[PDB]
Amino acid sequence: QVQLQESGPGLVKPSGTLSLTCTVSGGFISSRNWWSWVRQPPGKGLEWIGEVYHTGITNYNPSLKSRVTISVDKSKNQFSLKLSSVTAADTAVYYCAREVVGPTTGYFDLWGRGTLVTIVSRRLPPSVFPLAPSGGTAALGCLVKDYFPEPVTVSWNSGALTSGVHTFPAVLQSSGLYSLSSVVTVPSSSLGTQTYICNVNHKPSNTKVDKKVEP
Amino acid sequence: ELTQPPSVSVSPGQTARITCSGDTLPKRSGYWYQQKPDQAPLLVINKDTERPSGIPERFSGSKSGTTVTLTISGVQAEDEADYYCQSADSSFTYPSFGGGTKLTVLGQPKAAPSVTLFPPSSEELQANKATLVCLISDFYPGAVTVAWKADSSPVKAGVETTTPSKQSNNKYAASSYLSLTPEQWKSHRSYSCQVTHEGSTVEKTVAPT
Ligand SMILES: CCC(=O)N(c1ccccc1)C1CCN(CCc2ccccc2)CC1
C-alpha cells in the first residue's frame, strides 16, 4: 500500500516561507491520482491548499493562489509545498493527501500523518520546575510555567516511561502565557531507586530541558 | 458551500444522523470523513452511499438531492469524533468541505475526581515565585468547582483554572494554579485545594517544609 509522510521545518518566521515535502512510498508519483496539501488550524476545520498532477500541472485554492507553490520530483518520488509571506493565520497542521479524481467528482483516499507548522513571532521560554512526590502509589511531575506560543511536548525517561503518565491540557493565563503540568503515578516503592526525568521541549523558544524529579 | 450542523449528540446504542447540504451535491456527490484527535481524516462513506471495506457495517450514507446524510446505527463510544462532508464546486475546480460536526456520545457513568496538590518547588522559591498546582482527573460529568484556602480562609486572587477537557479514557481532566509570593507561602500554616463535583468535595492540603 502507498504511504505518505510529511517533513520539513515546524517553525517559520513571519513573512518567511513555509516549506514541506511529502515522501511517497509504496507507489509511484506517476499515476492517475492527484497529489494535494490540506491544512487544519488547531481546533478548526479542513482547508484545501492545492493539488498537483505528476506532469506538474497545478491548481490552487484561489484564496491562497498568490502564495502557494506545489511541485513534484519524480526522481525522489516526492511532492512539495511552499507557502510564502506567512502570518499567524498559517499556523496549522499540514497534511499531504492523495486525491482520486474522476471526470466530474473527486475525493481524498489517503492522508499523511500531519505535521504542525507554527509561525513564531513573539515567544517566551518556560521555566521547568520539578513537582517532587508511605506505601500505595505516589505522584510526581513537572511544571512547565509561562511559555508562548503553544505547544510544549513532555515525555518521561526519554519515552521509556509511558504507563501512568498524564500530561494535562495547558492553561491560558490572564497574562496571555501558557502553563502546563505533566504527572506520572508510580509505585511508592520505586521512588528510592528509580530515577525519573521529565523531557520538556518548547521548540519555538528552543527550550529543551531534561529535569530530574527527586524527593 | 456545504452546511453541516456543528454538533450532534446521541446516547449509546441510538442512531446518529448527520446531514450535509449544498447545491453541488447532486452533480459532484458527497464524501464523509471521520477524524479523531491527533489523527488524519478517514473516509467512511464514498460517493454518497458506498462503505469502504474496512469500515464497520453500522456506518451508512444516503442522498436526498441537495442534502446527503451519514447515519451511524447502534452508536458506540468509539464513534465520538468530528465528521466532515466534502464535495466540489459547481465548476469542478476545487473541493469544498463542510465545517465539521462533532458527534458527542452521552451516558458515560459518573466518576468522582482524583485530586493531587503540589506545593512550590524549591527551585521556584529561589526565583522568588511560588505556584501551587492542583490536578484533577478521571471525573464525569465535565463540571467541577475549585476553591482555594489559605489556612481556612478563602483565596480568590491569583487563581487560574482550566475548563475541563476530555481524556483518552473519556473522563475529564482539569487543573488549577494558585500564584503566591514566597512571603504568603511561608506565612500561613497550610494551603488547600477543595474540588467539588456533583455536590461531593475532595480536599488536599500542603504546607511549607
Ligand atoms: C482541464 C483542467 C482540469 O480538469 N482541472 C484543472 C483546472 C485548473 C488547473 C489545473 C487543472 C481539474 C480541476 C479540479 N481538480 C480536482 C479538484 C478536486 C480535488 C479533490 C476533491 C474534489 C475536487 C482536478 C483538475
CATH of the domain at A167: 2.60.40.10
Resolution in A: 1.8
Q: How far apart are CA A101 and CA A52, in angstroms?
A: 12
Asked if B40 and A106 come within 8 Å (Cβ–Cβ), the reply is no
A59 alpha carbon to ligand 1 midpoint, in Å? 7
CA B167 to chain centre: 7
**Collapsed DSSP state (helix, strand, coil) of residue B28:** helix
Shared-domain flag, residues A103 and A143: no
Neighbouring CB atoms inside 10 A of A129's CB total 26
Q: How far apart are CA A61 and CA A38, in angstroms?
A: 10
Q: Which of A119, A152, A187 is the last residue in one of the domains? A: A119
Q: Does the domain at residues B114-206 carry the CATH identifier 2.40.110.10?
A: no
Q: How far apart are CA B180 and CA A126, in angstroms?
A: 18
Give the mutation candidate from B47, B133, B156, B206 for the A interface (greatest A CB count, under 10 A): B133
List of residues 6+ apart from A16 with CB closer than 8 A: A86, A119
List of residues 6+ apart from A55 with CB closer than 8 A: none
Domain range for A78 is: 3-119
The CB-side HSE value for B51 (13 A sphere, CA atoms) comes to 13
The count of residues in chain A is 215
Shared-domain flag, residues A101 and A175: no
- Pairing outcome for strands A106-111 and B81-88: unpaired
- Which chain A residue has its CA at the smallest distance from B83's CA? A45
Q: How far apart are CA A13 and CA B73, in angstroms?
A: 47
Shared-domain flag, residues A112 and A207: no
Q: How far apart are CA A110 and CA B42, in angstroms?
A: 8
Cell digits of residue A167 = 500530561
Shared-domain flag, residues A67 and A167: no
Which position has the grid cell 473516509?
B43
Neighbouring CB atoms inside 10 A of A102's CB total 11
Give exposure, A137-162, as e/b (b: 16+ Cβ within 10 Å): ebbbbbbbbbbbbebbebbbbeeebe
Question: Going along chain A, which residue ranges are E strands?
Answer: 3-7, 11-12, 18-25, 34-40, 47-52, 58-60, 68-73, 78-83, 92-101, 106-111, 115-119, 127-131, 137-147, 153-156, 165-167, 171-172, 178-187, 196-202, 207-213
Q: How far apart are CA B101 and CA B80, in angstroms?
A: 10
Q: How far apart are CA A138 and CA B200, in angstroms?
A: 24
Neighbouring CB atoms inside 10 A of A28's CB total 11
Q: What distances in angstroms separate CA A100 from CA B16, B53, B95, one per listed residue?
A: 28, 17, 12
Q: How far apart are CA A46 and CA A55, in angstroms?
A: 26
* Facing residue for A48 by CB, picked from B94, B160, B173: B94
Shared-domain flag, residues A53 and A146: no
Which position has the grid cell 508510580?
A186
Give nearest CA residue, ligand 1 atom 10. Answer: A59
The architecture in CATH of the region B7-105 reads: Sandwich (2.60)
Q: How far apart are CA B125 and CA A154, in angstroms?
A: 23
- Nearest partner of A195 among A130, A129, A134, A143, judged by Cα: A130
Q: How far apart are CA A128 and CA B118, in angstroms?
A: 14
Q: What is the DSSP letter of B77?
A: G
Which position has the grid cell 458527542?
B104
What's the order of all strands across the beta sheet hosting A207-213?
A: A153-156, A196-202, A207-213
Q: How far apart are CA A118 and CA A13, in angstroms?
A: 9
The count of residues in chain B is 209
- Omega into A9 within 30° of 0, i.e. cis? no
Shared-domain flag, residues A34 and A96: yes
Cβ contacts of B31 on chain A, cutoff 8 Å: 107-108
**Runs of H (alpha helix) within B44-153:** 122-126
Shared-domain flag, residues A144 and A193: yes
Shared-domain flag, residues A56 and A23: yes
Shared-domain flag, residues A159 and A203: yes
Region of A124 (left: φ > 0; alpha: ψ -120 to 50; beta: rest) is beta
List of residues 6+ apart from B151 with CB closer than 8 A: B188, B189, B190, B191
Q: Which of A94, A119, A144 is the last residue in one of the domains? A: A119
Shared-domain flag, residues A44 and A104: yes
The answer to whether A214 contacts chain B (CB < 8 Å) is no
Cβ contacts of A153 on chain B, cutoff 8 Å: none
Cβ contacts of B165 on chain A, cutoff 8 Å: 169
Q: Which of A119, A140, A172 is the last residue in one of the domains? A: A119
- Nearest partner of A21 among A75, A100, A83, A96, judged by Cα: A96
Cell digits of residue A104 = 466530474
* Facing residue for B173 by CB, picked from A45, A168, A174: A168
- Which chain B residue has its CA at the smallest distance from A215's CA? B121
Q: How far apart are CA B63 and CA B70, in angstroms?
A: 9
Number of domains in chain A: 2
List of residues 6+ apart from A189 with CB closer than 8 A: none
Radius of gyration of chain B (CA): 24
Cell digits of residue B158 = 491569583
Cell digits of residue B179 = 500564584
Q: What is the DSSP letter of B46?
A: B
* Facing residue for B116 by CB, picked from A114, A139, A173: A139
Cβ contacts of B41 on chain A, cutoff 8 Å: 46, 108, 111
Amino acid occupying residue A85: S
Method for this entry: X-ray
Shared-domain flag, residues A38 and A113: yes
- Nearest partner of B28 among A98, A101, A62, A35, judged by Cα: A101
Report whether A16 contacts A86 (CB < 8 A). Answer: yes
Shared-domain flag, residues A44 and A62: yes
Element (H, E) at A28: none
Q: How far apart are CA B64 and CA B68, in angstroms?
A: 6
Q: What distances in angstroms separate CA B96 from CA A6, A54, A101, B43, one per listed residue?
A: 23, 23, 14, 15
Which residues belong to CATH 2.60.40.10 in chain B? 7-105, 114-206
**Collapsed DSSP state (helix, strand, coil) of residue A100:** strand
